[PDB]
Design a protein around this ligand. Structure first.
Ligand SMILES: O=C(O)C1CCN(CCOc2ccc3[nH]ccc3c2)CC1
Ligand SMILES: [Yb+3]
Ligand SMILES: [Zn+2]
Length: 608
């Protein structure tokens, strides 16, 4: 089984066992410079060369056995970067290991990295750097077999200006002054658990920490520490539930890092150090499902890993399934059903947007010649979850299916697997229920586009009030608008308010007068909850409310979570009155945006 996103030698040829990274972070040049020493095991007899992924990397030299060796960089292959073939000085027998030390430098335009000026930070005095390797950006940091089919341990020494702090997806292993430069510090790191290289992460900035649990510190700039400690105070209780469901947490520490606003995702499950968007800081812990999600990846994703990106649903579907169980344990089974039903709504939205026959609406996708960043959507999350929730209901309930989940994590821990491996184990675990399993339309679920062939059963208790209010608004005529008022919202949680808006957004546009009334009576303009504000602004823009233009533009640009920034820009571009402003704002902000976000927004806008 071939990873069509990687140009490196496959796991069947050789396997990286370990990376020792020794580098220096240069904020003046916006480069990372150093050596990556790869311990590689031959899987073949008489192995004489091998190939590594690179992207925008400057290679100085490659050293084996203390001597320089021949290598060559192939022609760049778009988003895949350039393959690097290395000639081994002596042929290797099967299972023989050697160390290959590559001296390299990154480009300032590394798609893995965002370099922030002091003014793009909270403190305004120091610069800031962060990485994001998933799916295939590790190659834009260092030469590697950039495929999740290979797992390696790592150690790193990172030299940074002494007033700044380095963190990695690893256990902190001490700090010292840089022996070769008084103005610099070296931070050391150890990751003892084998990981796919997409989980390598690095932050450098003016970071402070606060403890919030027996194995959790929150890290951020000083201005955000207090708020973050409170927002994420459920972390330990969630880790406890996660361990009950998934087995031992094997990674030692579970720290959180709250990034600056340009961070492109809700979170990223970097082992030992989850990265999260500051757009989670609602002030009431209401967006903590994102933390439950990142915690869950400690089992589904980081222990059991997708062998190629075609099988990404394995990572995300199971993680959302565990995420919803954590939240269901904390807040009740009716709440789990409410979230599950909301997720089905998001799947409807994704399918409608792509088109019901689009290949990216397939559960298992074929990424040959497709940039994974372009293919990325809610489909693998929600169609994946829908499959598992359907299977749960078919096979006798949540207690039974959780038994399978834990056994699946156990079976495939430290490994990389395909959808077939998963299905084979499902059939093994439930061998006494194979007749029921054979009733599943596997070909439809796994390989067909569109909505799943069957929708699960959802408890409606919490959803009813949201649908009822949304329907009141949708069917209202002008002479009904007077009946609405602030008391409509009195018994709705923030989650229900969000769902009301999601329900209403699906029927957008509404009449402009309706939207004006909704602001008049509910004052959604005052809500800072990022999810609620996002849906409200989309509703306003799609319903042609000019007053909403500056609000939408401000939210699109003052944070950069792609979930929010991409649809806000797209809506603003689709609205005749804001179209020119949207394009102009993008052009102006482009240079200081995250490189992946810049790329996708440009594509969305048909710009450049
Ligand atoms: O799921 C999470 O925890 C979030 C969202 C997804 N994340 C980064 C997404 O990047 C990827 C990774 C893998 C992918 N396969 C296809 C598209 C694609 C995009 C990390 C944080
Ligand atoms: Yb009427
Ligand atoms: Zn995830």
């Amino acid at each position: 089984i071939v990873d069509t996103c990687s140009l490196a030698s496959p796991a069947s040829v050789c396997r990286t066992k370990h990376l020792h990274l020794r580098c220096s972070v240069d904020f003046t040049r916006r480069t990372l410079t150093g050596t990556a020493a790869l311990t590689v095991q031959s899987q073949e007899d008489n192995l004489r060369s091998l190939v590594l992924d690179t992207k925008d990397l400057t290679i100085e030299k490659v050293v084996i056995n203390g001597q320089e060796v021949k290598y060559a960089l192939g022609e760049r292959q778009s988003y895949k970067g350039s393959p690097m073939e290395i000639s081994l000085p002596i042929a290797l027998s099967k299972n023989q290991e050697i160390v290959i030390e590559i001296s390299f430098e990154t480009s300032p335009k590394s798609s893995a990295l965002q370099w922030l000026t002091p003014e793009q930070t909270s403190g305004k005095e120091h610069p800031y750097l962060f990485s994001q390797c998933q799916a295939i950006h590790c190659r834009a940091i260092l030469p590697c077999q950039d495929t999740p089919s290979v797992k390696l341990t790592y150690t790193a020494e990172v030299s940074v200006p002494k007033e700044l702090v380095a963190l990695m997806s690893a256990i902190r292993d001490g700090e010292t002054p840089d022996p070769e430069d008084p103005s610099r510090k070296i931070y050391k790191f150890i990751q003892k658990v084998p990981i796919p290289c997409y989980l390598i992460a690095l932050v450098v900035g003016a970071l402070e920490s606060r403890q919030i649990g027996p194995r959790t510190l929150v890290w951020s700039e000083k201005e955000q520490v207090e708020k973050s400690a409170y927002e994420f105070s459920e972390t330990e209780s969630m880790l406890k539930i996660a361990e009950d469901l998934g087995g031992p947490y094997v990674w030692g520490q579970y720290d959180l890092l709250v990034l600056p606003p340009s961070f492109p995702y809700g979170g990223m499950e970097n082992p030992c150090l989850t990265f999260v968007t500051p757009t989670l800081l609602a002030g009431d812990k209401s967006l903590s499902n994102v933390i439950a999600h990142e915690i869950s990846h400690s089992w589904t994703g980081n222990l059991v890993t997708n062998k190629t990106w075609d099988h990404f649903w394995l990572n995300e579907g199971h993680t959302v399934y565990l995420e919803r169980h954590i939240c269901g344990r904390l807040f009740g089974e009716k709440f789990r059903h409410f979230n599950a039903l909301g997720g089905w709504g998001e799947l409807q939205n994704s399918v409608k947007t792509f088109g019901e026959t689009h290949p990216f609406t397939k559960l298992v996708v074929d990424l040959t010649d497709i940039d994974p960043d372009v293919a990325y959507s809610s489909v693998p999350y929600e169609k994946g979850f829908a499959l598992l929730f359907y299977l749960e209901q078919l096979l006798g309930g949540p207690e039974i299916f959780l038994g399978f989940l834990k056994a699946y994590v156990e079976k495939f821990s430290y490994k990389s697997i395909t959808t077939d491996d998963w299905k084979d184990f499902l059939y093994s675990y439930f061998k006494d229920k194979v007749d029921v399993l054979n009733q599943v339309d596997w070909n439809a679920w796994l390989y067909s586009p569109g909505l799943p062939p069957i929708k699960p059963n959802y408890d409606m208790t919490l959803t009813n009030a949201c649908i009822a209010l949304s329907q009141r608004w949708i069917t209202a005529k002008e002479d009904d608008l007077n009946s609405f008022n602030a008391t409509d919202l009195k018994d709705l949680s923030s989650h229900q308010l969000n769902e009301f808006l999601a329900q209403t957004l699906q029927r957008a546009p509404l009449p402009l007068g309706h939207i004006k009334r909704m602001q008049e009576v509910y004052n959604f303009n005052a809500i800072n909850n990022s999810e609620i504000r996002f849906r409200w602004l989309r509703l306003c823009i799609q319903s042609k409310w000019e007053d909403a233009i500056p609000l939408a533009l401000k939210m699109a640009t003052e944070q950069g979570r792609m979930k929010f920034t991409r649809p806000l820009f797209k809506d603003l571009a689709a609205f005749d009155k804001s179209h020119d402003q949207a394009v102009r704002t993008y052009q102006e902000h482009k240079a200081s945006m995250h490189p992946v976000t810049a790329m996708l927004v440009g594509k969305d806008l048909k710009v450049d």
